[PDB]
Write a protein that holds these residues in place. Structure first.
Motif, PDB file in Angstrom:
ATOM      1  N   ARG A   1      -0.419   8.975  13.385  1.00  0.00           N
ATOM      2  CA  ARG A   1      -1.789   9.232  12.921  1.00  0.00           C
ATOM      3  C   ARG A   1      -2.839   8.743  13.928  1.00  0.00           C
ATOM      4  N   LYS A   2      -3.025   7.426  13.994  1.00  0.00           N
ATOM      5  CA  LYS A   2      -4.020   6.824  14.884  1.00  0.00           C
ATOM      6  C   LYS A   2      -3.466   5.596  15.602  1.00  0.00           C
ATOM      7  N   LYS A   3      -3.732   5.511  16.904  1.00  0.00           N
ATOM      8  CA  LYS A   3      -3.226   4.424  17.742  1.00  0.00           C
ATOM      9  C   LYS A   3      -3.518   3.013  17.238  1.00  0.00           C
ATOM     10  N   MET A   4      -2.483   2.183  17.243  1.00  0.00           N
ATOM     11  CA  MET A   4      -2.606   0.798  16.814  1.00  0.00           C
ATOM     12  C   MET A   4      -2.794  -0.128  18.016  1.00  0.00           C
ATOM     13  N   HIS A   5      -3.416  -1.277  17.769  1.00  0.00           N
ATOM     14  CA  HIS A   5      -3.610  -2.302  18.784  1.00  0.00           C
ATOM     15  C   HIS A   5      -2.888  -3.580  18.358  1.00  0.00           C
ATOM     16  N   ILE A   6      -2.482  -4.388  19.334  1.00  0.00           N
ATOM     17  CA  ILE A   6      -1.830  -5.666  19.050  1.00  0.00           C
ATOM     18  C   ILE A   6      -2.762  -6.585  18.266  1.00  0.00           C
ATOM     19  N   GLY A   7      -2.231  -7.173  17.196  1.00  0.00           N
ATOM     20  CA  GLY A   7      -2.986  -8.089  16.348  1.00  0.00           C
ATOM     21  C   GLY A   7      -3.543  -7.413  15.114  1.00  0.00           C
ATOM     22  N   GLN A   8      -3.255  -6.125  14.981  1.00  0.00           N
ATOM     23  CA  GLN A   8      -3.755  -5.328  13.874  1.00  0.00           C
ATOM     24  C   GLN A   8      -3.000  -5.629  12.589  1.00  0.00           C
ATOM     25  N   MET A   9      -3.744  -5.779  11.498  1.00  0.00           N
ATOM     26  CA  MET A   9      -3.172  -6.079  10.190  1.00  0.00           C
ATOM     27  C   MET A   9      -3.042  -4.816   9.324  1.00  0.00           C
ATOM     28  N   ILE A  10      -1.917  -4.695   8.624  1.00  0.00           N
ATOM     29  CA  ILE A  10      -1.681  -3.567   7.722  1.00  0.00           C
ATOM     30  C   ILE A  10      -1.241  -4.108   6.363  1.00  0.00           C
ATOM     31  N   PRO A  11      -2.169  -4.154   5.412  1.00  0.00           N
ATOM     32  CA  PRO A  11      -1.911  -4.811   4.147  1.00  0.00           C
ATOM     33  C   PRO A  11      -1.272  -3.921   3.089  1.00  0.00           C
ATOM     34  N   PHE A  12      -0.082  -4.326   2.659  1.00  0.00           N
ATOM     35  CA  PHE A  12       0.597  -3.727   1.524  1.00  0.00           C
ATOM     36  C   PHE A  12       1.083  -4.860   0.621  1.00  0.00           C
ATOM     37  N   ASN A  13       0.164  -5.759   0.271  1.00  0.00           N
ATOM     38  CA  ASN A  13       0.479  -6.912  -0.581  1.00  0.00           C
ATOM     39  C   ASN A  13      -0.176  -6.830  -1.952  1.00  0.00           C
ATOM     40  N   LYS A  14      -1.137  -5.925  -2.090  1.00  0.00           N
ATOM     41  CA  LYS A  14      -1.862  -5.777  -3.346  1.00  0.00           C
ATOM     42  C   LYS A  14      -1.759  -4.356  -3.903  1.00  0.00           C
ATOM     43  N   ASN A  15      -0.581  -3.767  -3.721  1.00  0.00           N
ATOM     44  CA  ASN A  15      -0.258  -2.454  -4.271  1.00  0.00           C
ATOM     45  C   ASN A  15      -1.139  -1.331  -3.708  1.00  0.00           C
ATOM     46  N   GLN A  16      -1.583  -1.491  -2.459  1.00  0.00           N
ATOM     47  CA  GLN A  16      -2.399  -0.471  -1.798  1.00  0.00           C
ATOM     48  C   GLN A  16      -1.628   0.846  -1.743  1.00  0.00           C
ATOM     49  N   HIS A  17      -2.305   1.949  -2.058  1.00  0.00           N
ATOM     50  CA  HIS A  17      -1.668   3.261  -1.953  1.00  0.00           C
ATOM     51  C   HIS A  17      -1.516   3.651  -0.481  1.00  0.00           C
ATOM     52  N   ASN A  18      -0.409   4.318  -0.167  1.00  0.00           N
ATOM     53  CA  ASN A  18      -0.199   4.829   1.168  1.00  0.00           C
ATOM     54  C   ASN A  18      -0.510   6.339   1.302  1.00  0.00           C
ATOM     55  N   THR A  19      -0.300   6.868   2.500  1.00  0.00           N
ATOM     56  CA  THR A  19      -0.539   8.270   2.803  1.00  0.00           C
ATOM     57  C   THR A  19       0.332   9.183   1.942  1.00  0.00           C
ATOM     58  N   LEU A  20       1.566   8.769   1.671  1.00  0.00           N
ATOM     59  CA  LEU A  20       2.463   9.551   0.830  1.00  0.00           C
ATOM     60  C   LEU A  20       1.903   9.705  -0.599  1.00  0.00           C
ATOM     61  N   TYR A  21       1.403   8.610  -1.154  1.00  0.00           N
ATOM     62  CA  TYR A  21       0.732   8.664  -2.439  1.00  0.00           C
ATOM     63  C   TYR A  21      -0.496   9.603  -2.466  1.00  0.00           C
TER      64      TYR A  21
END
Lengths: 199, 210
Positions: A20-40
């Motif tokens: 999708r979009k380029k990531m950078h080092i140190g980037q946070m991706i939160p899936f701890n609070k039931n965040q919906h993803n792209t599949l959802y």
């Protein structure tokens, strides 16, 4: 003591193919609070309607008359797309229901990042994307504080019209686990620690 | 997660010390349509009900053994979907049952997420809160040409949920995320209630034989 809030998540690495979009080092991706993803968002939120604002169910029922079903052009397109989306949404809903019943410890397929267990595995996934002409921007290393599940996509319910009770058996086998080439579900706090290769 | 153990049970060295504080005992009212029940009859709820069977297990195929989805796909050609006769009936009954199964699956999922304490619509029995309410459900059944054989009084040991069925997801083609929001409203849901009941159920009176 005398205190009020007095009171499962491990540390591990995983590998992720960026599209999708380029990531950078140190980037946070939160899936701890039931965040919906792209599949959802894709199978649960989007929809297609004909020019009159009707959905597949509405179109099918408007056209079922004299025990015959003759649909054409956009109407047929909307009915088929509706069926394809819904059978796929039902798949994820049944699988999620099974996880809540019997495997509540694993990440939800609706609230996770999809990754590979190793760099070698990421490379194998990359080879499949390529043979499908799927653009890959990077392969990245992640450090996770949370949980994972190694799944075999082959064990998920299919896009066929078999009874839901049989689809439930299939989801059950998915969650029990395979062997092959795993699709890792990951949740919790995810950090990009390394960009292995930037295509 | 954590649960409270009673002091009385501490120090004993048995394994199954489950059970009580969450049990209720109450009367409910039930419309019988399948087969007549009798005084003192017991019903058990880890068990699937008739709604689960008809929406989840049962299927209807065409003469060639094809389900609604296969028929749909193999008839979608050059911008047309022309289905006739038995093939049309199968696709329609498939869509009909499937949107109902999906409703029940979404509602169960949400129950598991937020209200794991309430009875499941896939194993429970359905009841009316009062005899007066049972009578209104009855007139509704008569209108829709489904004969009621009896209205019976049940004594339940177990639990219940008082739901408003108008709040369940409908049999329409809206996105699942919207159906999930509707399921949340249902489970919260403040009409003519439909009681979900599970536990130990006993027939203590046949108010009406019809």
């Amino acid at each position: 003591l005398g205190t009020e809030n007095l009171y499962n998540e491990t540390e591990f690495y995983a590998y992720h193919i960026v599209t999708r979009k380029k990531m950078h080092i140190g980037q946070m991706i939160p899936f701890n609070k039931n965040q919906h993803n792209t599949l959802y968002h894709f199978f649960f939120e989007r929809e297609q309607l004909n020019a009159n604002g009707e959905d597949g169910i509405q179109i099918l029922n408007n056209h079922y008359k004299n025990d015959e079903l003759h649909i054409n052009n956009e109407n047929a397109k909307v009915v088929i797309s509706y069926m394809d989306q819904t059978i796929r949404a039902a798949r994820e809903t049944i699988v999620e229901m099974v996880r809540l019943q019997e495997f509540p410890e694993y990440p939800s397929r609706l609230s996770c990042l999809y990754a590979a267990k190793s760099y070698e595995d990421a490379l194998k996934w990359k080879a499949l994307f390529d043979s499908y002409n799927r653009e890959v921007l990077q392969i990245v290393k992640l450090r996770v504080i949370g949980s994972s599940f190694e799944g075999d996509g082959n064990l998920l319910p299919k896009e066929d019209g078999i009874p839901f009770s049989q689809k439930i058996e299939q989801a059950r086998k998915y969650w029990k686990g395979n062997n092959e080439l795993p699709e890792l579900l990951i949740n919790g706090e995810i950090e990009v620690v390394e960009i292995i290769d930037d295509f």
